[PDB]
Paper text:
Interaction of HIV-1 envelope glycoproteins (Envs) with the cellular CD4 receptor and CCR5/CXCR4 coreceptor mediates virus entry into target cells. HIV-1 Env trimers of most primary isolates prefer to adopt a metastable closed, pre-fusion conformation and transition, either spontaneously or in response to CD4 binding, to downstream conformations. Subsequent engagement of the Env-CD4 complex with the CCR5 or CXCR4 coreceptor moves the Envs down the energy gradient on the entry pathway, culminating in the formation of a gp41 six-helix bundle that facilitates the fusion of viral and cellular membranes.
We solve the cryo-EM structure of an unliganded, incompletely closed T/F (1059) SOSIP Env and identify structural determinants of protomer flexibility and increased sampling of incompletely closed states. To gain insights into the structural features of the incompletely closed Envs identified in this screen, we determined cryo-EM structures of 1059-SOSIP, and for comparison, of the well-characterized BG505-SOSIP. Both the 1059- and BG505-SOSIP trimers were purified using Galanthus nivalis lectin (GNL) chromatography, which exploits lectin binding to Env surface glycans in a conformation-independent manner, followed by size-exclusion chromatography (SEC). We obtained cryo-EM reconstructions of unliganded 1059-SOSIP, resolved at 3.6 Å with 737,588 particles, and of BG505-SOSIP resolved at 3.7 Å with 975,399 particles. Within these 10 subclasses, we observed a larger range of protomer motion in 1059-SOSIP compared with the limited range of motion observed in BG505-SOSIP. Further, 3D variability analysis of 1059-SOSIP captured scissoring motion of the protomers, and partial opening of the trimer characterized by outward motion of V1/V2 loop from the trimer apex. Overall, the 1059-SOSIP cryo-EM analysis reveals occupancy of a wider range of protomer conformations contributing to augmented outward motion of the V1/V2 loop at the trimer apex and higher asymmetry of the Env trimer, compared to BG505-SOSIP. Trimer asymmetry, increased conformational flexibility, and scissoring motions provide the long-sought structural evidence for putative “breathing” ability of HIV-1 Envs.
Numbering used by the authors:
A (entry chain B), D (entry chain A), F (entry chain C): 32 to 56, 82 to 132, 154 to 183, 191 to 330, 332 to 363, 367 to 393, 410 to 416, 419 to 456, ...
B (entry chain b), C (entry chain a), E (entry chain c): 519 to 548, 574 to 652
């Protein structure tokens, strides 16, 4: 018999594509399907990084620039004094302000000649809030529910989700804080573990709690430039002068480090491995805690084959993501600062392994490893006996 | 009720009963303007391509395009009871535009 | 000629003859961008939802789905001669999704 | 006896929703329907308020700042002389300028230490144009037609319109000008009359005409203070120096106050009421007349248990809608300025009653009190005897 | 065969078989958000202006409105075998809105 | 017998349009159709001019302004010195720079008195690239393929194209550079030959090669005024100095003028045609060669009834379209630069004939004379026998 062409609308097939995901702040299982995933070719990570750059640029656009503070400072933390113009242009008034050591260079501010300093707007905050990346109509976001997932490879338990979970945009350099933990084992994923250039991402099945503090009791002082331009800075400290530190329980870190070493030995050949030490922005552990930007020295943790106290520095002028042509002055926070977080992931780089990485893109690649964006193609053709 | 794309692993005979589950969710209204405009255009392009061939608003319709064995020589029970739509699309990805223009030619002729 | 939306207070036995003047106004082509995209999306959503059910080209259509008494058990004289469309929308409001799902399933046969 | 499902299109039902009403610059009567209204929870007021602020911020964006003003003004209305830089950077010229008294704080401009002063472009015009708010396809606007509607509660007679009437964006603090008169009587309406903090909106049925004038013959002069940057100031006055005043007929105002008292005593208990007097933006009557922002002392209108002359002052630096950082230098206008207006409504605040009009959203609640936006839902299902 | 808009010089009888190549390319696929929304709105305006009259799913439709000789009165073979579409659009340009209103009125019954 | 009206969709007819085309960086013959064209009321010229002005203004937005250069200069091409501030705002220092004669007036800069000088950003370049204009969906672009087309009138060979040919947005005043050559013969076209006001566009069938060079060996120097605001200028010249000039073959230009005079004698009456010489912006040949804006004296070419050498000057500060208060500082290039270009067109003005081309829309009328945009109207009605 002859066979004739039919057309079907609503065919359940998909093809790979890139779309314009939007932020937002159901799940069905897909049986008998073996869609393959790849964590190192995701467009969602690039789109998330571009959106974070676009959001950080837009918040610092309208408010005050710190051009008139590129003056000579008579510094004696440090106590410094300078000449500055008051709101009347003809009059010049002497003032004073405390500065941290990393903000000043022999004094003057550290980022005068490099780029222009735009002060952060005095009411904004850097508290991370969860962001769900969601796909428009006609697209779908797949998820791989395999427990032993390694990144590049085919999945056996694929599911279509409405959109992603609560990805918190936490900024960190070496230890990934407040992330999502693995289900069964400590999992190490790399694009090529036999290459020295490629970074190594570790995910911990059990978190390590970290406590950090700034015991100096600062107070906030305001300095006026002219019409409608102000500047907030520390005036004095009411109390004893102390350093800022972070505490990690040593037994938890030792057990976690033993598990990392065991699984990393299992991935590599049967050889001994040692953990070694790592510009303060790429060497030290950089994160924000309560509004202040800490820079903590992590050479005590990675020194292997009660508590551990890590000394830290506070920095107010930051120029992260290496954008030449922009800088940022975070306003100081009055009172004591205390915060706690869970260590979830560590970024390693090649016997000898050391924490390394100035890219902030690998922080979000450890959250978006389960997901993939597809495009629905509902039209289909098939032969039927008679039409 | 298997939900949206729930019958993607089911056979072509079984997945043909869930066309309205997928077809209801191609259109929005469930910064952001690009996504909504893109969804509207993808649905509208598919609807225009369906309406050019004829019979957009009803099920039973005559097409009168003969099937070529060079496209697929597989028996019909093997098509409709053994495989899914994904490998069928993989088999007939390159031949699809010929089928589309033959359906368009049979519309006016 | 009652005009647009003027049969809202009438009973649904008499309001059902006036559906043309409500249908003819909901059109396109006659903060601008948000309003235009919203109007396009609402028109396309109504047309797609009407076209999946069958009867895309007419205002009064009726399917093979049997009415369940659990949704509403009152008689036709109570429905069509005692109540307006607002009250009837208030009765079966939580059962609209089940009825729409049953209509979409029955049209696929 | 079997009932089968029938699908109707064009069903006349609606639900409450908030939409994006677009500006533009027909009524049908709905019978046997009762719809409740609430003008304090109306969303058209917030939409109009945000649109007017966005229009003002769009107008003040490219029209250049006033820095380097705020130099030390030496003043003898006032005659002030100051040193300013010329178009060449390293040279200083001497200029003189006539400024009003309220623009000057002890000299120095009034908005120097609070906000950046963006000068207003000389093309600009503050004349109100009527704006009709229209609803898109699928939405509708319901109008309440009760002649004694008190703002809340159900409305017996409801009608539907495509767009609102000619709402004029008149900015005025204490006395509403060029508004919509009531149908029958003076109507006093409030959210609840027992709370003293809630504002009281009075709407008159007979308008009271006001005549305001600026009898000084000012001349305008351009001062250039930079490369391609210049601004306009009053050069000199020709003729006798006179004050700006507004004239109100005393018989009309006495009858208006007696009607307001007569209708207001019907709400409160049996108690005599007295009108008492009320930072010039909130204390005295501030309004625009011919391009100059008059500030008129209204203690004679509200002092009770031929013509009434109210003295007025002129300001050129205003910072409307209470937002810090957005002041505007209004350019002066040469020649005598005269305007006439119709007094439509008075804003009151608690017996003793004094005018308080600090917010600008109560100017637009007196116009958008009839209207309400709804979302039409054309689909519907019902049982019949088909098939 | 003649490509997009290639039968503009031919007669109506020759160009009536090739309406698809002008009908297909009215969608996109070849700030720019506004022009893109404008293209979608123009296509939807033409589509629902067609859909008010009936025959939403076809390119050639036939209506019940009788032809009036006041609009044009020349012979049918001259119209359908000798004249281009543009010359006919020039002739009845004063009466297109009236014919559209009569077609809209007849479909209302 | 009896006829009924029928509706057709996809009808090949079109009407006039004024839509906004989109940039980009298929053809159908259309037998048996005639369309009228008009290059003087063509709307693509205004669209191209608005787009070019918008991109040229957008490219000059983010980077540095030269307000601090507006200071007196103690000059000895001139060697000038000035005083600016350092990167530190407190102290000042003395620098020197080499400026051309056309950029200074008796010494201050050319446009500090009226305009705002903005430096062209060092990342961007002035090299033109081909630009294709494509009609949006629902519209079409018609092209007239007639070889004898005189600018307005009916066209016999009309064809439809998706996008226009590659048009380079070159900058020229008197001689059209790198344009589209005529098909077979030198063609003159104008709006009204008897009108003195209307310009004259001349197109050539064979091009004339022009070679221009800058023999000085300039060296780039960097100058800073503060945080992140740099400035580039010539530091010194290595070797002997020599003026810039352009070379043109004399016999080829003489034959070109003979053919031009023949066609001007054909269009006008049979009489004596004489060419005469033509503010450096409109008198001299203003064009770009290798990144520096040349200004060449052209009185040798247009004086008639081996090579020829035209002296040229160099401007660093230009103002395209003579915008009110906005100009541009082009940063100088280091070392010698040479360039070569085709001469394909001359703009003339009326017998005596003098070249003047100060408007840049007549530059682009020579490239978009073949094109026209139309709007497709796919609906149509026609009587048919069948009901
Ligand atoms: C993080 O903390 C560690 C430990 O506090 C820092 O390591 C310390 O680095 C300094 C300078 O590199 C070492 O000083 C050196 O001492 C040797 C004698 O041992 C002397 O010969 C050298 O001339 C120099 O003075 C110091 O010994 C070393 N601490 C330890 C325990 O070895 C590290 O620098 C910190 N990280 C950063 C980024 O600053
Ligand atoms: C972070 O970890 C460090 C070290 O584990 C903690 O430092 C410890 O703090 C306690 C209480 O402040 C100290 O105890 C005190 O010792 C003194 C003698 O020095 C004694 O006179 C007091 O009565 C009291 O017992 C303890 O000595 C100190 N340990 C070290 C090695 O210095 C620190 O408190 C932790 N911080 C947080 C926020 O958890
Ligand atoms: C495959 O993934 C699914 C994920 O849905 C697993 O099924 C359960 O799904 C429910 C749905 O909400 C979850 O709440 C459960 O946590 C899932 N797991 C269990 C154990 O119930 C399913 O188990 C996975 N199968 C395999 C073989 O990994
Ligand atoms: C990881 O990268 C290394 C890079 O050295 C790859 O090793 C080489 O791959 C090339 C390409 O086929 C071979 O010709 C070489 O013989 C390989 N070895 C060496 C020592 O150069 C390696 O294949 C990569 N691994 C994965 C899984 O991609
Ligand atoms: C940190 O410093 C602040 C600023 O002096 C302290 O706050 C003061 O505390 C005293 C004692 O209770 C009060 O009398 C003052 O009124 C407080 N000042 C303000 C501005 O509130 C604070 O107590 C200090 N904290 C510690 C732990 O030393
Ligand atoms: C970080 O600080 C928290 C308190 O904010 C610590 O939690 C306390 O831990 C002690 C000792 O384990 C317990 O006795 C308390 O009951 C805990 N209190 C709370 C509120 O949890 C936590 O231990 C600190 N982390 C580290 C590593 O020391
Ligand atoms: C996924 O594949 C499995 C394996 O074939 C399906 O399970 C059985 O499929 C056969 C083939 O039709 C049926 O005869 C059996 O009745 C199925 N088992 C059960 C328990 O029903 C399974 O149905 C497939 N899943 C989907 C969604 O199609
Ligand atoms: C405006 O007037 C209406 C009546 O037209 C008031 O509504 C009444 O409110 C009282 C107090 O809650 C109720 O007991 C009545 O049943 C209401 N009547 C109706 C018809 O709903 C309304 O309260 C008035 N608004 C104000 C602010 O006073
Ligand atoms: C505004 O009202 C005042 C009344 O206070 C008017 O002033 C009077 O004008 C008449 C006519 O010129 C004089 O005879 C009176 O002597 C004035 N009264 C006083 C107290 O001076 C004034 O003319 C009115 N102005 C306008 C424009 O109507
Ligand atoms: C407010 O009203 C009172 C009473 O009407 C005014 O007081 C009168 O002022 C006049 C003018 O000086 C005197 O001749 C009367 O004797 C006063 N009467 C009383 C009872 O005091 C008062 O002047 C008014 N205030 C203003 C600003 O107009
Ligand atoms: C511009 O610079 C020149 C130097 O290049 C200045 O000329 C010197 O002036 C001083 C004081 O008048 C004399 O002692 C030197 O002998 C001059 N040198 C030369 C080479 O002439 C000149 O004065 C400067 N111009 C101004 C206005 O200051
Ligand atoms: C009318 O114009 C068309 C182009 O729009 C000309 O067609 C071209 O003819 C040349 C020479 O025969 C061919 O090399 C090209 O390939 C043709 N173009 C296309 C798109 O086919 C045509 O010759 C012109 N006719 C006249 C009489 O001038
Ligand atoms: C071209 O220019 C000529 C003059 O140079 C125009 O001719 C004049 O047109 C005006 C307006 O119609 C008449 O009042 C004059 O009498 C005309 N003068 C002559 C000498 O004819 C002519 O209209 C312009 N346009 C065209 C298309 O030729
Ligand atoms: C272009 O070159 C000619 C060369 O002759 C210049 O004309 C001379 O200009 C100077 C200065 O004004 C006069 O003294 C001569 O008498 C002129 N000679 C002639 C023959 O006219 C002309 O000025 C130059 N043009 C420009 C813009 O540089
Ligand atoms: C314009 O052209 C005329 C004609 O060639 C030039 O006049 C000649 O100039 C040369 C140079 O001095 C003399 O030797 C000839 O005798 C002149 N001939 C005549 C007829 O006068 C004139 O110099 C040219 N002008 C410019 C500015 O280039
Ligand atoms: C441009 O034209 C000039 C002539 O105006 C050429 O200059 C000649 O160059 C040759 C070789 O260098 C010399 O022998 C001649 O004496 C020069 N003539 C004159 C009048 O000076 C020059 O070569 C041409 N080309 C370039 C690239 O400049
Ligand atoms: C105009 O000048 C250009 C170079 O500036 C000439 O273009 C080159 O000419 C040679 C010789 O025919 C070709 O081999 C090259 O392919 C051409 N380059 C390009 C990019 O097309 C051109 O010949 C000159 N003349 C005309 C009439 O354009
Ligand atoms: C008596 C009076 O004030 N008349 C004015 C009138 O002169 C003006 O043209 C118009 C424009 O707003 O406003 C009113
Ligand atoms: C089927 O396709 C082949 C090429 O794929 C072609 O040669 C053959 O003619 C086609 N069959 C028919 C009946 O046209
Ligand atoms: C009516 O609805 C109830 C509850 O949803 C269900 O149990 C019953 O089977 C339904 N009846 C029919 C005839 O579908
Ligand atoms: C035909 O058109 C003319 C136009 O004047 C009109 O008067 C006449 O009634 C029309 N005839 C019919 C049958 O509609």
């Amino acid at each position: 018999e002859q066979l004739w062409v039919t057309v079907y609308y609503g065919v359940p097939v998909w093809k790979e594509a890139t779309t314009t995901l939007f932020c937002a702040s159901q799940e069905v299982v897909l049986e008998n399907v073996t869609e393959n995933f790849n964590m190192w070719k995701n467009n969602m990570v690039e789109q998330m990084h571009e959106d974070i750059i676009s959001l950080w640029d837009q918040s610092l656009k309208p408010c005050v620039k710190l051009t008139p503070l590129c003056v000579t400072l008579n510094c004696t933390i440090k106590n410094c004094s300078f000449n500055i113009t008051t709101v009347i242009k003809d009059k010049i008034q002497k003032n004073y302000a405390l500065f941290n050591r990393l903000d000043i260079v022999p004094y003057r501010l550290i980022s005068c000649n490099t780029s222009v300093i735009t002060q952060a707007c005095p009411k904004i905050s850097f508290e991370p809030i969860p962001i769900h990346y969601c796909a428009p109509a006609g697209f779908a976001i797949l998820k791989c529910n395999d427990k032993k997932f390694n990144g590049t490879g085919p999945c056996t338990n694929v599911s279509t989700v409405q959109c992603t979970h609560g990805i918190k945009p936490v900024v960190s350099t070496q230890l990934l804080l407040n992330g999502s933990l693995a289900e069964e084992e400590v999992v190490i994923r790399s694009e090529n573990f036999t290459d020295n250039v490629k970074t190594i991402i570790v995910q911990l099945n059990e978190s390590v709690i970290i406590n950090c503090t700034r015991p100096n009791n600062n107070t906030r002082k305001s300095i006026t430039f002219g019409p409608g331009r102000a500047f907030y800075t520390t005036g004095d400290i009411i109390g004893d002068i102390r350093k800022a530190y972070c505490n990690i329980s040593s037994t938890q870190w030792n057990n976690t480090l033993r598990q990392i070493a065991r699984r990393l030995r299992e991935q590599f050949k049967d050889k001994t491995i040692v953990f070694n030490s790592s510009d303060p922005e790429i060497v030290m552990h950089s994160f924000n805690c309560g509004g202040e930007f800490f820079y903590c020295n992590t050479t005590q943790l990675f020194n292997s084959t009660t508590y551990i106290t890590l000394p830290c520095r506070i920095k107010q002028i930051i120029n992260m993501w290496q954008e030449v042509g922009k800088a940022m002055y975070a306003p100081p926070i009055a009172g004591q600062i205390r915060c706690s977080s869970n260590i979830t992931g560590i970024l390693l780089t090649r016997e000898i392994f050391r924490p390394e990485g100035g890219n902030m893109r690998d922080n979000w690649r450890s959250e978006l490893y389960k997901y993939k964006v597809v495009k629905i193609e509902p039209l289909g053709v098939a032969p039927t006996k008679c039409k | 009720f298997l939900g949206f794309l729930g019958a993607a692993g089911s056979t072509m005979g079984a997945a043909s009963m869930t066309l309205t589950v997928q077809a209801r969710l191609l259109l929005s209204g469930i910064k952001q303007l690009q996504a909504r405009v893109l969804a509207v255009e993808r649905y509208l392009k598919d609807q225009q391509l369906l309406g050019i061939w004829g019979c957009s608003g009803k099920l039973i319709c005559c097409t009168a395009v003969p099937w070529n064995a060079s496209w697929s020589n597989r028996s019909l029970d093997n098509i409709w009871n053994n495989m899914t739509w994904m490998e069928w699309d993989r088999e007939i990805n390159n031949y699809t535009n010929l089928i589309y223009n033959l359906i368009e030619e049979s519309q006016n002729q």
